Amino acid sequence: SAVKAARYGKDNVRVYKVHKDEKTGVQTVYEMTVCVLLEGEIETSYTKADNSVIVATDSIKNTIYITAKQNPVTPPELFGSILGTHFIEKYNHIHAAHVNIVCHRWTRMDIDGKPHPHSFIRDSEEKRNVQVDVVEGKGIDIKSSLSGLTVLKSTNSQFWGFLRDEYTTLKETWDRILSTDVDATWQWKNFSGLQEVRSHVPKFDATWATAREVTLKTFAEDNSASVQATMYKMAEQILARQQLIETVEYSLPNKHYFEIDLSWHKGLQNTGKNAEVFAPQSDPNGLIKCTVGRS
Amino acid sequence: SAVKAARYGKDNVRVYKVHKDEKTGVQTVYEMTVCVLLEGEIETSYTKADNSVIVATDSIKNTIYITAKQNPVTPPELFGSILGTHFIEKYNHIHAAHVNIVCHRWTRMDIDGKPHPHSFIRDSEEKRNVQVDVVEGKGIDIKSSLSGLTVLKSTNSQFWGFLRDEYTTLKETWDRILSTDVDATWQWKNFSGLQEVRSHVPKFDATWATAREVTLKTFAEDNSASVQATMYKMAEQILARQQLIETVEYSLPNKHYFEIDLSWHKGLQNTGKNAEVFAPQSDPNGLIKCTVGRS
Amino acid sequence: SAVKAARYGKDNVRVYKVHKDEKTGVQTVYEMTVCVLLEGEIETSYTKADNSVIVATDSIKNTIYITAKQNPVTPPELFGSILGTHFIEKYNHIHAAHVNIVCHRWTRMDIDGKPHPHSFIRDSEEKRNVQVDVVEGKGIDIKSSLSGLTVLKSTNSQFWGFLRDEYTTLKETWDRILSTDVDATWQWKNFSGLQEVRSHVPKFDATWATAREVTLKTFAEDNSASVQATMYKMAEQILARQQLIETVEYSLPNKHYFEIDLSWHKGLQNTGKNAEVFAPQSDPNGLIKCTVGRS
Amino acid sequence: SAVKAARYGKDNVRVYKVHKDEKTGVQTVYEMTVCVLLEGEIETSYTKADNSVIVATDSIKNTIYITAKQNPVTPPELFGSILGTHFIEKYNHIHAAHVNIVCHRWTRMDIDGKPHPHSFIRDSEEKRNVQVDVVEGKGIDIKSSLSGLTVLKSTNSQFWGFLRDEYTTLKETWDRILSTDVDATWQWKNFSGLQEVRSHVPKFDATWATAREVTLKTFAEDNSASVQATMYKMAEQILARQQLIETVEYSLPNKHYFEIDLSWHKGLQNTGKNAEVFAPQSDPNGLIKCTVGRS
Numbered sequence A, B, C, D: 001s002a003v004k005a006a007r008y009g010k011d012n013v014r015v016y017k018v019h020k021d022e023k024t025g026v027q028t029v030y031e032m033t034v035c036v037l038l039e040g041e042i043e044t045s046y047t048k049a050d051n052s053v054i055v056a057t058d059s060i061k062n063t064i065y066i067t068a069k070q071n072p073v074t075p076p077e078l079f080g081s082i083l084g085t086h087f088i089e090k091y092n093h094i095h096a097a098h099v100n101i102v103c104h105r106w107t108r109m110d111i112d113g114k115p116h117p118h119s120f121i122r123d124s125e126e127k128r129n130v131q132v133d134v135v136e137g138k139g140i141d142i143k144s145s146l147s148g149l150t151v152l153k154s155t156n157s158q159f160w161g162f163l164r165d166e167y168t169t170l171k172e173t174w175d176r177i178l179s180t181d182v183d184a185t186w187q188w189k190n191f192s193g194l195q196e197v198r199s200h201v202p203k204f205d206a207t208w209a210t211a212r213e214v215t216l217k218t219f220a221e222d223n224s225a226s227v228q229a230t231m232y233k234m235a236e237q238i239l240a241r242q243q244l245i246e247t248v249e250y251s252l253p254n255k256h257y258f259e260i261d262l263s264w265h266k267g268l269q270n271t272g273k274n275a276e277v278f279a280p281q282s283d284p285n286g287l288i289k290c291t292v293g294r295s
């Protein structure tokens, strides 16, 4: 037997950082969960009990805090690139670092219509994420994403004209509820190293904001022929607005809301045009994916 | 042996309702999870296998949908009172109904600064809840609550002057992070029945809004001497603003963020006045409760 | 306004303890999650920002570890009583302690048919719990429970003869699946203090074991007329076997498995006597409770 | 823009099946959660709103139940292969099916030392899983796994001799707790189609059983030099015992239990050789992975 692949490191490292403006008294907080996994010439720790090649996972944890102390933590694409680069430069025998960051929302509170200097609210479990792969001699690959964005529209969704055979019971419809949890990922062109990532810093927050806006607007305005058709429209627009993105991937559950036939009870009408009360279904759910790239 | 207490019914009944304004084209959605438990002369179903006294839990589920079809579902205090009253009036041998409702957020989307007519977003897992106990001959007891409101302030919290003995390691502090998940419940004066609940309908949404506002403002503005002292200020204000509330109860975790001493690494300064990077602690957590009533 | 009730302390304190037999080399592990909440003359911490009355929640955490170091942690009824008694005796102004303990399973591994001296497996998320209320001048009240015991029987459950009216669609049945998650609590007679709890130590593990055995056997062997009827049989037996128990409470979800009509597809028969494939339902669920005491 | 990849289908389809032996009266239950995602010539549903190419996800759900009705559901490697093959053969334009199955434990109850004919218990959340990829013209690729196997050993784990630099605070140790949740996957050699999968049916359950046994025994008996070294020993043995496996992958968290220094309190000794009470850490955790193949 032989080691074909190996990676190890520290997961679920929670980190908070505060920035204090002395001039204005305004404070800004950031909170993330970080995972760092390393690869390189470490096979002997598995095969020969040779720990001399192991940077302890405990040390990886220390490094994350030290790096957060000495560097900006935003945008997360930059912080992840700094963190991954550190490991491949510091250790001769480590050749790849894989950094995953989940950013948690702490939105400044408005009190009496004024932004509060140091109080924050968690408005939704929506996350902004990055995956950064730093590979020695091959640059920096960054995937940025948003996840946990939960939306619903109560009309202007249709689904008809699908394949019908002996397995099909689903009725065609011209008016249904559409609800999903959005997971959207945009993959950046490969960067040559940290200097190049730094050169594009302003694009990261702007592209996140654009991706979010395009997702929300398209969902709200499309008279949707299917999840497939609406998601493609979203991806097409993001690619048009940011030339440095190579691909956009969406993964969308179709969270079903079923009509409830109440006609057995005093002829009560609650289906089709008379449908008012529905039963949200926890499971099963449709799952629709697509990856869109350039011609 | 004897049956000392018994209750049974249906839990986790998910319900969605849409309202469609034909004049404006605007749609509004409501989504809840409902639990209904009944009590009454049902002991024989346990002791003698006498099912004749059982209103099937499946029928309770049907009733929830039918009731939602025929009545407004907002405010939830009203819907819960209608639902509970139904069971005690319809069935001679059922003498109490206990209705719990959790309301989920579906907030209308703003697209290009305009409210969208039929598209919604789940902005946070914060819930609005009610517990309604309808007891034959004793009226309607309603407890309203908000839960899952997660907040953090980065300064203007202190904790000093506590008891110190041989069990104490905690250092006094004049500047710390304070973060919590708010669970706040206000208990209404007993209502004589449905007519009286109907007479107070406008107070329900207004009092929820007030409770939320007072919680957020007091948290943001108090230079907090402790969780205990700040929560009492909140409760005092809610009681002052709504005479029909008898008691206010808060249950607050103290979600700790620990300083990280980095001085072992090149004398890096990250404690006290130099603290920038902290470690959020998943557990354990302080838990502080209080119930405030009128003199 | 006035403080009507207040309690505070530390929740989610995870504790592991190992016992090492030097003679045999055998090791035994215990892992728990502990919550301690205190009450007493502490109103001024809420109303006057008087922290001098507060035993810091951090100190409560320290106390839990120190107490676990100096005392046996099993049975949990004893450990909880020691822990609660500590607070009311040590602090003049603390008059009640409320201790909740959740015990996690670490079952010794069998390797080649022999019990291993120091290796353990988590066989199921079933928990053994205690709630201990220690109140100055009123003794020690203990509620013991098991929870998270998930069972299913594929036949020998019936449900017919229930009330039928205009809200009823459920068909009567003489053969169905019955599945539940068992939550069972037995409440001990009040104990005068720690000496009396110590005197009954052997009864705690024995009664837990009996409660579990009676639950499993009755579930498996009863040709069940309803959840109500089967649960009553369980409670009756536990009360008969342990005279020091005053009441037994069961809370049981009815986790539904629905038949799937497949007759639309080539006349496939999958209902009633031909039912083989079913759809487990995540929600809603029946919820049936009862508390049984002595005549 | 162009569609680079697309797949869609139904997730979270819960299925239960009962087998009834008429001769013995013994019943056996199976419960799974199934996901099926399809690929093929479906790009136009995304780009042109052409639903004619879509096999509705609702129909995929129906198919899963019908297939379970007409075929054995065990071993899951066989059921997944039957299910995936169905879609690529039935639909000309579907060229790949991806089937994921999670099998839930329902272990027959022992009542009075005898196996019960129709009563079952969920002994642990450990799962047995399969991933089956059926690709037209390329055969059947099967990955089998176990997950959610949670173990702990209280001694006979060491960790010393790792890299020490200016980022390192971890002390070397010759005696620590080791606890993990095992995720282990074995990948079968490619099969040419369903006939070949059928020919190897007895190997599936046997290899699962072997993988489990080797994992438990090696964990219990190895005087572990690191997670890395112990996991490699496991993988090596599985590959030696089943020639039809090509690779074995383990992914193991290192769930830390920290010593608690109590010496500040009356010189209490609770570290090193005197360590009895520990604090389990919820996060962060080490994460160690490896994939082992043949020379």
Ligand SMILES: O=c1[nH]c(=O)c2nn[nH]c2[nH]1
Pocket (backbone or CB within 6 Å): A008, A054, A055, A056, A057, A058, A059, D159, D170, D225, D226, D227, D228, D254, D286
């Ligand atoms: O077994 C271990 N492997 C590791 O890589 C490691 N790093 N810190 N502690 C550890 N323990």
Ligand SMILES: O=c1[nH]c(=O)c2nn[nH]c2[nH]1
Pocket (backbone or CB within 6 Å): B008, B054, B055, B056, B057, B058, B059, C159, C170, C225, C226, C227, C228, C254, C286
């Ligand atoms: O055992 C049951 N008890 C009940 O009260 C009930 N109601 N519907 N189905 C049921 N099954």
Ligand SMILES: O=c1[nH]c(=O)c2nn[nH]c2[nH]1
Pocket (backbone or CB within 6 Å): B159, B170, B225, B226, B227, B228, B254, B286, C008, C054, C055, C056, C057, C058, C059
């Ligand atoms: O606000 C607080 N209240 C308390 O009771 C406490 N105990 N430790 N830290 C604390 N902070």
Ligand SMILES: O=c1[nH]c(=O)c2nn[nH]c2[nH]1
Pocket (backbone or CB within 6 Å): A159, A170, A225, A226, A227, A228, A254, A286, D008, D054, D055, D056, D057, D058, D059
């Ligand atoms: O938008 C949808 N896409 C689908 O593929 C599908 N299948 N069933 N319902 C559906 N809705």
Ligand code: NA
Pocket (backbone or CB within 6 Å): A087, A088, A089, A090, A091, A092, A093, A094, A095, A136
């Ligand atoms: Na390197």
Ligand code: NA
Pocket (backbone or CB within 6 Å): B087, B088, B089, B090, B091, B092, B093, B094, B095, B136
């Ligand atoms: Na009545």
Ligand code: NA
Pocket (backbone or CB within 6 Å): C087, C088, C089, C090, C091, C092, C093, C094, C095, C136
């Ligand atoms: Na006292």
Ligand code: NA
Pocket (backbone or CB within 6 Å): D087, D088, D089, D090, D091, D092, D093, D094, D095, D136
């Ligand atoms: Na095909």
